[PDB]
Amino acid sequence: KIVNIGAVLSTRKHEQMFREAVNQANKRHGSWKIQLNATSVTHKPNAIQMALSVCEDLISSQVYAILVSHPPTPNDHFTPTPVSYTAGFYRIPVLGLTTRMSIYSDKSIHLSFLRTVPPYSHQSSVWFEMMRVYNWNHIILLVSDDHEGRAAQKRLETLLEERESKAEKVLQFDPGTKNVTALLMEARELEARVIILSASEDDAATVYRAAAMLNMTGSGYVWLVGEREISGNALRYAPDGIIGLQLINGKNESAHISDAVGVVAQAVHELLEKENITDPPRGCVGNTNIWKTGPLFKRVLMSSKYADGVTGRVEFNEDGDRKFANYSIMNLQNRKLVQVGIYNGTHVIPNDRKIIWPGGETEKPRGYQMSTRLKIVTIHQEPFVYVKPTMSDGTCKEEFTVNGDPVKKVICTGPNDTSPGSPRHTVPQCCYGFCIDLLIKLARTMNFTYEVHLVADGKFGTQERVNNSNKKEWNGMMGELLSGQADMIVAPLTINNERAQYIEFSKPFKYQGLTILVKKPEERITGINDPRLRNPSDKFIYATVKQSSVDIYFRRQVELSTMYRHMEKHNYESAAEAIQAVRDNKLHAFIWDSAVLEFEASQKCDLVTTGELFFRSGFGIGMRKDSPWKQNVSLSILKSHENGFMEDLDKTWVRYQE
């Protein structure tokens, strides 16, 4: 007829308040014959013998609830873990009250741990409420604590599942280092300014000093931190105008103890109304039998619904967290904490105080500034991308064409040869041609600067297994684009269904098919329907560029596996290698686009194309995902389609013959 409650509490005044709450718990519950005893223990500066003393004292006491209520501990470990593990050996609920670590959220590790405080990842949902208010989509994540970093990434993907957007940059590294400013500058070069930080006080002060020295706290830079990042020297190193969070009664222990007493008391009076009552045995000596109503009492604690307390509607979810939590939103106005918002369990309301930002006006700074210098990457296409070495030092010889058109070149940067050939030789040379004039037309239509560089290899990019952990990766232009080093691929991109699933496409500027390059008895082949090419031999030598989209289009064709097995022994690096090889009469056929070989037939009369025209497709501009550089650029491309500028580009290279 007795119920024992164990507690690890230090101060005698709060012990007296705890005993007073135990005494007042039996007030409104009638004259029932249940009794409530409480046993509180102090704290030795160690942790092993503390765990020993507490575990054998609570075995000898046979308690039902175990409480740890020590915020101001000098050790920064904050580990009530061993007593919770010892109670989880017999499945006894330990109600943690102080820490908010995400390692306690794993119920597979902490089998019988409950708590009335949520982890900080729920604050990101509050920050998602910022996304419900300030209408901001692209974020920049920075988490140093990797024990909670996977849970923060999980919660972030759970929040972004609704809008189906993507985080622009995520970062995880070892806490303790200092040279993280390179990734800060890489995030600075991005369009967004939203900064989400999840670390301890030392790394927060380190990144505050790094933003202060590099002036990343100017206009438009969105800063959004929590309670751990506004304490200690991080509060001293914080810039003025930063927005932070505050836990209402997060450190106020006296009402929190009474709330915990009310929760435990109503849980015990709920459990007394049901059958199958079991008791914890004397597990110190000769008792390893588990307490059989562990998950039963846990299920009692799952449906615990309350209506008493100064905090309010305390309620457990499936994770045993805190529902309907009042939060405060603070601002740092001239090294002074100024309250600028309140938060109920679903909605943010700013108070009568104004919101003064570190940049300009008091309204929200739209920190989504698009890149005025679009990084352009391309492959060396032979009739389209002419690359010429410089004359004296980084210069371009301004030669004139035969039609009175001056060639407007650009200073591009490119490697010299392949990686076994050239170890490291990347020089700036002169790029011009077809798509360069297309980019000149785009820069004439819309005012934006650019940065033309070249892809490191001579491949488009295929979907290949990386050599560890069985993961798909891309390479080439797609590998340089998806890594964030490139912005817009201006190249004759072969449009297919696979790449449409991953990135968005624009309107095609080129429209052509496929053809066969031969040299001039049947000297022609007339397409794929030659039966000798269905079952080839060592005579008809035909191949294509290694890691090309033509090979992917043939890989989708499940009835031409013989050509896929035949052409893999003769794939070349570039198409010019195939031109030189068939120039020496070593090749016999080559599947390639139409107008390139038409221009090369206009250059060299021995180069002969075939008669058929299959795979009538289009080539456009390689693009990113949903972006404001899509609609206006596509309208500019269609404006180039409707006028005679396509005919002008034909007059430059296509219509011009010899």
Partner: protein, 499 residues
């Protein structure tokens, strides 16, 4: 150095074989003072854990702790992880609750387990699903913890595999099922392979609802992990006979061989760390009272007697020993297959039916089909080494290739097939919508009677080891006497080839 091996066991495992585990072991002894302390504990409370750690850590500064467990308590490994975090001593978990898989370790703790995590087990199970072309499947996740990591690992594995998995959406749970809202999500299921991640007491109700909703058919599959499959003795009658499980519990390797391998890893780490730094033995003196050179990130490179016993970044083994088991008709967890370094071995490459999961299941829909290797009809090629998967138009089959003429033992090598009759059989499977059992004959050619004994496909069909012969076969009088041919479809006579 000084290593203590304490064992908590219920089975009569004596101590003197651990005393004999010191003499001939470590013949090339690079530490000059290697000593072992063998102890046996009868109780399984953490008070005895703290007591024996304070005894043996003060017991002439023992630097190695080895523990095995016989019970079903996963909190003992967490207690030993806390002990390894406090005392800074490398502690190894061998068997039972000492080898149960935990989620995330700490840099302050140097505790390690000899087991197989749920991520590598999910990799092995998806390797099984890839090797069977079971691409249309589902996923049911309960409120058992450690589940969002499982869903995310499945999502990344599907996004990083050459299959392109046809995955049905995840059936999620909130509480114990009301059979009102979970009923709608369970009635969305129409696929065969069903994956599940829960506890055993939840799985009893899940299988009871699945039998109540008829999800235990011959087409429908059920693959469960090792954490839900508990004791080998405690098997309730609600389990379907044919339940696929993957557990690293190998009965061929006893606990003594595993702790011998653990002592080999400990002495290997000590000998390799002594060659780099001098003052290697550094421990805590006693528990009462108020480290730089550690073995926490040192013994990733380890190999004992050729056994690839290397360690991961999370603290588990790189290449463990997984065991694929099923549930037979005799209600026993039947040992079936073992696992290699990275590739998977299959002792039973022929996938069994277990078509009668219960008593009242009248089902006769499978069809046994055999064919013969002919070039314009059945092109028989190897599996693609880049994908380890037969392409869309090719179908897998087996071939019992013998090793020699000395023994009759062989291997069922799986190969891909295409051609004319493969397309005919695929279009028959499109029209009739049945289930087929395709394999190859190893007796020889079409058919020839030698003293009332037929051979080849005639010997397979007439003696009723198969159902029908879809492949190419000539038709004459006695073949039409012994079986019933269908109508002819192709006009194939005989001819003579000349120049």
């Amino acid at each position: 150095l000084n290593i203590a091996v304490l064992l908590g066991h219920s089975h009569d495992v004596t101590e003197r074989e651990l005393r004999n585990l010191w003499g001939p072991e470590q013949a090339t002894g690079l530490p000059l003072d290697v000593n072992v302390v063998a102890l046996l504990m009868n109780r399984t409370d953490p008070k005895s854990l703290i007591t024996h750690v304070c005894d043996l850590m003060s017991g002439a500064r023992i630097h190695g702790l080895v523990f095995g467990d016989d019970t079903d308590q996963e909190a003992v490994a967490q207690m030993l992880d806390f002990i390894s975090s406090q005392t800074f001593i490398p502690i190894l978990g061998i068997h039972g609750g000492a080898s149960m898989i935990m989620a995330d370790k700490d840099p302050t703790s140097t505790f390690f387990q000899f087991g197989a995590s749920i991520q590598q087990q999910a990799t092995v199970m998806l390797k099984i699903m890839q090797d069977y072309d079971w691409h249309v499947f589902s996923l049911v996740t309960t409120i058992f913890p450690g589940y969002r990591d499982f869903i995310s690992f499945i999502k990344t594995t599907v996004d990083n595999s050459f299959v392109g998995w046809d995955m049905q959406n995840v059936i999620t749970l909130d509480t114990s099922f009301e059979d009102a809202k979970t009923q709608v999500q369970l009635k969305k299921i129409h696929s065969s392979v069903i994956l599940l991640y829960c506890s055993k007491d939840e799985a009893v109700l899940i299988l009871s609802e699945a039998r109540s909703l008829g999800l235990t058919g011959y087409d429908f599959f059920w693959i469960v992990p090792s954490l839900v499959s508990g004791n080998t003795e405690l098997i309730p009658k609600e389990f379907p006979s044919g339940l696929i499980s993957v557990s690293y519990d190998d009965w061929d390797y006893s606990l003594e061989a595993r702790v011998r391998d653990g002592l080999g890893i400990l002495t290997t780490a000590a000998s390799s760390m002594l060659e780099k730094f001098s003052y290697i033995p550094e421990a805590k003196a006693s528990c009462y009272g108020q480290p730089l050179h550690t073995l926490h990130q040192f013994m990733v490179n380890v190999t004992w007697d050729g056994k690839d016993l290397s360690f991961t970044e999370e603290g588990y083994q790189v290449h463990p020993r997984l065991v694929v088991i099923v549930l037979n008709k005799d209600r026993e967890w039947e040992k079936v297959g073992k696992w290699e370094n990275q590739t998977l071995s299959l002792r039973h490459a022929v996938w069994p039916r277990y078509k009668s999961f219960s008593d009242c299941e009248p089902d006769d829909n499978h069809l046994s089909i055999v064919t013969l290797e002919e070039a314009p009809f059945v092109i028989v090629e190897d599996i693609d080494p880049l994908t380890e998967t037969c392409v869309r138009n090719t179908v897998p089959c087996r071939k019992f290739v013998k090793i020699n003429n000395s023994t009759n033992e062989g291997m069922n090598v799986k190969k891909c097939c295409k051609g004319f009759c493969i397309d005919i059989l695929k279009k028959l499977s499109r029209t009739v919508k049945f289930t087929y059992d395709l394999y190859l004959v190893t007796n020889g050619k079409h058919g020839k009677k030698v003293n009332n004994v037929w051979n080849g496909m005639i010997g397979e069909v007439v003696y009723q080891r198969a159902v029908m012969a879809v492949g190419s076969l000539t038709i004459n009088e006695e073949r039409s006497e012994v079986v019933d041919f269908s109508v002819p479809f192709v006009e194939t006579g005989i001819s003579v080839m000349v120049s």
